[PDB]
Amino acid sequence: MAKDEVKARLAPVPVYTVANPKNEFVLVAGENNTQLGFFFFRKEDAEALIEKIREENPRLARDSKILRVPMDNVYEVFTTPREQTGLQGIHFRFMPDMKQVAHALQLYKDAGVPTRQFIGVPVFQAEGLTVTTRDMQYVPLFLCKEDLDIAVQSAYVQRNAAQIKLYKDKADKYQADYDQIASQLEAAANGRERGGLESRLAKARVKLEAARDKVESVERAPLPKVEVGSFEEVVMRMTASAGNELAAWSQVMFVAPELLRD
């Protein structure tokens, strides 16, 4: 995928950074003059960083401010000559809030392989669910599991109410079935036709309530299997994509964290 399309697809979701007033990143240099940046998906994290800065330097903390940058610009920051603006080890990383990290950890371990290790920022999705416009159907990606289930519960109840009155159409047409069956079992003399239509009624109501218990078992079936991934891997696949997976990626839309609630 061309760079511009990736940039256009990431824009609706921002990140937060702390800087000087003069639009300069504040870096945490450690050993061997290697310096680490940061981008937080929640302002509380930058707030913690600045209130930790204040307790060991009040000058920078009195000058530092918080900036809300759209992920287009940070993506651009990554994939450029990092030595152009200067890099002697300016390691940018991300920081996901540990609520979603705990959600993803438990989801990860319950799926069969229990581990207490996570890499990258969680992205949630649920198969079967897709937001459709007037022309083409897009697939959404949720950064926070909260809006994920907020959407999926309404979607599930809509679709299963749909399955219920679909079965009620089946059931009214099957009241018609039983009517024609009363017109098919003993209204005439005994013999071939009538016994054949007895077996007809048997198989008919058999498949009818088999589909009943089917719709009930999907009523009994949990909400669609939620799958989780890492943001960095997602974008690395998005950039170097071509062919069929390109066509798959060309319809992803990222939802904003805490958007569906308010």
Partner 1 sequence: XXXXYXXXXXXXXXXXXXXXXXXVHVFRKXXXXXXX
Partner 2 sequence: DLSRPAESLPARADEAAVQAALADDGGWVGTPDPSKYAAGTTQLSARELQEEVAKGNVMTWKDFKQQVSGLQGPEREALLALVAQRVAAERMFFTLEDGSKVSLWDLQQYVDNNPELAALAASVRRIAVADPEDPAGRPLPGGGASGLDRSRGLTGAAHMSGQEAEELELDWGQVGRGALWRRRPTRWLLGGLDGVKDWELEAYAHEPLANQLLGAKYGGRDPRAVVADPAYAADVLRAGPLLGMTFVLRAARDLPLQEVASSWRGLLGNYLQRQAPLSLPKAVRPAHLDPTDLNGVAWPALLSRPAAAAHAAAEAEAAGAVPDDEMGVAWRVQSGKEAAASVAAAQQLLQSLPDALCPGPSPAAWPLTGTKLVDEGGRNWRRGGSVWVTLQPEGGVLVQAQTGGVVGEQESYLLTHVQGQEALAGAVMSAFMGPQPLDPELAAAARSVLLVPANGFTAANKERDPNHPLYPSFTGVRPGRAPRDVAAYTLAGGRTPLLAAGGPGEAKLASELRTVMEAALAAAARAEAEALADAATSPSSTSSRAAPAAALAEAEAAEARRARGRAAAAAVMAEGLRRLGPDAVAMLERTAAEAEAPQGGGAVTSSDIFSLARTLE
Partner 3 sequence: NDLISIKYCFNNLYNYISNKTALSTKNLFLFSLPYLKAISPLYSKFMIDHSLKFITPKTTLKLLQHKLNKSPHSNSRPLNHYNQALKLINGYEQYKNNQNITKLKLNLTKTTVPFKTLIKKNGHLSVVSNANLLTGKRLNSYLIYVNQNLKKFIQLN
User: What is the token pair recorded at 216?
Assistant: 């009930």
Q: Kindly state the helix (H) or strand (E) to which residue 63 belongs, with its residue range.
A: helix 58-63
Distance (Å, whole) CA 144 – CA 59: 35
Q: Kindly state the helix (H) or strand (E) to which residue 182 belongs, with its residue range.
A: helix 145-182
Distance (Å, whole) CA 146 – CA 253: 17
Tell me which of partner 1, partner 3, partner 2, none is bound by residue 25, counting a contact when its beta carbon lies within the kind-specific cut-off of 5 to 8 angstroms. partner 1
Residue 19's CB: how many other CB atoms inside 10 A? 16
Asked whether position 37 contacts partner 1 by CB under 8 A, the answer is yes
**Comparison of 57 and 158: residue with beta carbon closer to partner 2:** 158
The least CB distance from residue 135 to partner 1, in Å, is: 36
Report 215-234 residues binding partner 2 (CB under 8 A): 224-225, 227-234
Contact 130, 137 (CB under 8 A): yes
Q: Which residues contact 45 (CB under 8 A, 6 or more apart)?
A: 16, 95, 97
Report 42-61 residues binding partner 1 (CB under 8 A): 45, 48-49, 52-53, 56-57, 60
Contact 144, 257 (CB under 8 A): yes
Contact 252, 131 (CB under 8 A): no
Asked whether position 108 contacts partner 1 by CB under 8 A, the answer is no
Which residues sit opposite 154 in a β-bridge? none
Asked whether position 5 contacts partner 1 by CB under 8 A, the answer is no
Between helices 145-182 and 192-220, what is the axis angle to 10°? Answer: 170
The least CB distance from residue 240 to partner 3, in Å, is: 4
Return the range that interacts with partner 2 (CB under 8 A); candidates 39-47, 54-62, 199-207, 253-261.
Answer: 253-261
* Local structure of residue 222 (DSSP, 8 states): P
Asked whether position 109 contacts partner 1 by CB under 8 A, the answer is no
Out of 67, 101, 111, 166, the only residue in the binding site for partner 2 (CB under 8 A) is 111
Asked whether position 114 contacts partner 1 by CB under 8 A, the answer is no
- Site map 135..164 versus partner 3, x via CB under 8 A: ------------------------------
Return the range that interacts with partner 3 (CB under 8 A); candidates 75-83, 95-103, 128-136, 200-208.
Answer: 75-83
Distance (Å, whole) CA 96 – CA 16: 11
Binding site for partner 3 (CB under 8 A): 3, 79-81, 233, 236-237, 239-240
Binding site for partner 2 (CB under 8 A): 1-5, 8-9, 11-12, 107-108, 111-113, 119-120, 123, 125, 127-133, 136-141, 150-152, 154-156, 158-159, 162, 224-225, 227-234, 237, 240-256, 259-260
